[PDB]
Amino acid sequence: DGKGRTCPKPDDLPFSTVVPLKTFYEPGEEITYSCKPGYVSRGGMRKFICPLTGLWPINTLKCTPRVCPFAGILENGAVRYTTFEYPNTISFSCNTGFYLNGADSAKCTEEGKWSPELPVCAPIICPPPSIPTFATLRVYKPSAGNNSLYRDTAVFECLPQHAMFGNDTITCTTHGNWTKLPECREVKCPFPSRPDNGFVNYPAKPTLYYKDKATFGCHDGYSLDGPEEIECTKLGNWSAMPSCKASCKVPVKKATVVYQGERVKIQEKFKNGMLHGDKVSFFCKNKEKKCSYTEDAQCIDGTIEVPKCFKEHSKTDASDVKPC
Ligand SMILES: *[C@@H]1O[C@H](CO)[C@@H](O[C@@H]2O[C@H](CO)[C@@H](O[C@@H]3O[C@H](CO)[C@@H](O)[C@H](O)[C@@H]3O)[C@H](O)[C@H]2NC(C)=O)[C@H](O)[C@H]1NC(C)=O
Ligand SMILES: *[C@@H]1O[C@H](CO)[C@@H](O[C@@H]2O[C@H](CO)[C@@H](O[C@@H]3O[C@H](CO)[C@@H](O)[C@H](O)[C@@H]3O)[C@H](O)[C@H]2NC(C)=O)[C@H](O)[C@H]1NC(C)=O
Ligand SMILES: *[C@@H]1O[C@H](CO)[C@@H](O)[C@H](O)[C@H]1NC(C)=O
Ligand SMILES: *[C@@H]1O[C@H](CO)[C@@H](O)[C@H](O)[C@H]1NC(C)=O
């Protein structure tokens, strides 16, 4: 006692480590502060001898994280980060059009450097595309040397007499390959039958291929129940096969009717008969409630059923009676 003093357990400083660590020390004993790995201090390792007073000195040591080289700028991309100090991770991604050449993330090591090495963004690019069999291509600019860049496109057309299957355009994708490629096959259609009461035309040659046109027509009594022009489709048949159907003679001498939602005189509107499929609504009275309604009738291959309740006058035309 008096001379028999000791030093206490040393203070535990931020991110430090002390050796030898004991609960008390005789005077003359030595301790050694050192920053934890990943950290560093103004001056570094402090060393103290327990003095006779039993009081450890003042400790200048202040330990702070190492800082890895600045890494907040990724040419053509983006770095997510807190700080570039140990032991933080930082992650990377590229702007659109570019791919990441290197690791997606990196850690600041205790050694004070980035692991893995910081990546780089690079242009996504596709190689020259292959021409499918029986095709040419006539949309192709290589925008990157001989190679195409992301979202570039090429477009193929078949040969004459050949039918494409699949979209005609390919795009250079994110992964540096092109989108699904089309196929070009040869397609044949049979000869089209001439229709009863009409005619049909096509060019004078031994067999008929994809996108060949055939045009139809009817004799004066008749009209088509389909399109005037057809073509040879990809599946080896035609667009349609139209018939020549018979017109109807005006079913009555005089009457007002609805034709496509408008009142017309059937004698004026169909003076030269009704075409096949021409539909019309006739006016009939409801005898009981002294009002008027319509019922329909249609030309069907030279026949039109003038509805039962209609009556032809040389009281008034249901036309002129109020609606029900
Ligand atoms: C261009 O290259 C990419 C990348 O390799 C191709 O994408 C890959 O496509 C395959 C199939 O489309 C994916 O695999 C799987 O197929 C099975 C079928 O058994 C399916 O059940 C799974 O759900 C899955 O889709 C593969 O995951 C995918 N890879 C990537 C990274 O997306 C692509 O097909 C290529 N494009 C062309 C035109 O060849
Ligand atoms: C030209 O010829 C084709 C092929 O022979 C005709 O296609 C027929 O219709 C479809 C495909 O277009 C085939 O698939 C199935 O049809 C049913 C109809 O109920 C549909 O609901 C389903 O999705 C099913 O996949 C069908 O098998 C095929 N017919 C035959 C006999 O093979 C096409 O319609 C023709 N075009 C003209 C304008 O004549
Ligand atoms: C593509 O570029 C290479 C490298 O310069 C060159 O040798 C080659 O002739 C080019 N190909 C075409 C089709 O121009
Ligand atoms: C193929 O591509 C577009 C969209 O990618 C699609 O809407 C259409 O089926 C095709 N368009 C053209 C112009 O060929």
Side-chain angles (χ1 to χ4, degrees):
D1 307 346
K3 294 292 94 51
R5 291 230 156 107
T6 50
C7 293
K9 188 169 152 158
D11 296 324
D12 195 51
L13 307 188
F15 314 117
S16 76
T17 233
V18 162
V19 189
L21 181 52
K22 307 166 134 187
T23 45
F24 74 92
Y25 301 79
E26 303 302 329
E29 292 193 3
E30 179 174 63
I31 59 171
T32 322
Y33 277 78
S34 341
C35 289
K36 272 155 109 144
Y39 299 81
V40 284
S41 187
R42 236 75 196 74
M45 277 190 174
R46 304 285 193 278
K47 246 125 87 80
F48 298 107
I49 287 64
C50 177
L52 215 43
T53 59
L55 321 179
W56 293 115
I58 213 67
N59 200 340
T60 41
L61 194 82
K62 175 162 276 185
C63 289
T64 48
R66 291 163 137 286
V67 305
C68 287
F70 178 73
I73 289 179
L74 203 210
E75 276 172 22
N76 288 304
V79 195
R80 170 163 274 92
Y81 60 89
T82 293
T83 62
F84 305 117
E85 83 199 315
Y86 170 94
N88 294 358
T89 302
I90 66 181
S91 50
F92 319 95
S93 49
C94 291
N95 291 339
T96 69
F98 287 92
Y99 75 96
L100 190 53
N101 179 7
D104 65 5
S105 91
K107 275 228 196 54
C108 189
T109 61
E110 19 177 80
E111 296 206 320
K113 58 197 316 200
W114 291 116
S115 183
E117 305 210 321
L118 299 180
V120 137
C121 290
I124 295 162
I125 78 180
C126 301
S130 35
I131 309 306
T133 344
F134 311 115
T136 67
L137 82 172
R138 207 45 277 146
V139 184
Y140 191 61
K141 176 94 288 175
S143 54
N146 261 272
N147 304 326
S148 321
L149 281 167
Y150 176 64
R151 283 176 185 167
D152 276 23
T153 45
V155 196
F156 311 108
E157 71 206 318
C158 298
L159 276 321
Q161 307 168 18
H162 293 272
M164 192 164 296
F165 291 75
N167 189 307
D168 69 324
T169 307
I170 45 161
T171 21
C172 175
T173 71
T174 262
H175 307 299
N177 63 353
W178 299 98
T179 47
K180 165 158 264 183
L181 222 57
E183 320 198 19
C184 284
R185 311 201 259 279
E186 206 181 50
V187 165
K188 281 166 170 180
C189 302
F191 282 105
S193 34
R194 170 180 70 258
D196 287 332
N197 310 289
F199 61 99
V200 72
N201 292 318
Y202 46 68
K205 93 199 184 197
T207 232
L208 294 174
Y209 295 123
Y210 173 83
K211 290 274 165 180
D212 279 321
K213 315 299 185 204
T215 46
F216 286 67
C218 296
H219 296 320
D220 279 346
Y222 302 87
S223 68
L224 294 159
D225 73 354
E228 179 177 317
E229 195 191 71
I230 58 163
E231 49 152 50
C232 175
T233 76
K234 68 170 78 212
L235 305 99
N237 47 17
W238 301 80
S239 338
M241 272 316 221
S243 299
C244 276
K245 291 318 192 79
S247 296
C248 298
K249 273 182 134 203
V250 76
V252 295
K253 202 67 53 48
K254 62 182 148 188
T256 325
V257 288
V258 181
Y259 179 57
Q260 307 172 132
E262 304 198 351
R263 295 163 75 84
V264 305
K265 298 286 177 57
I266 205 178
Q267 321 87 255
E268 294 165 6
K269 189 51 154 165
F270 302 107
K271 62 221 292 275
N272 305 332
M274 301 174 78
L275 294 179
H276 177 56
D278 282 351
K279 192 165 197 180
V280 129
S281 301
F282 284 89
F283 287 93
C284 316
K285 313 186 212 191
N286 175 226
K287 76 276 134 199
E288 205 218 66
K289 304 191 65 162
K290 310 194 181 192
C291 66
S292 92
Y293 61 101
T294 80
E295 257 154 34
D296 299 31
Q298 197 184 9
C299 190
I300 302 293
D301 200 22
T303 310
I304 176 160
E305 299 279 21
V306 45
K308 69 95 192 276
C309 55
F310 181 82
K311 267 287 131 55
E312 203 179 355
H313 168 236
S314 293
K315 230 67 169 52
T316 55
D317 206 330
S319 332
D320 295 343
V321 175
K322 67 183 161 184
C324 312

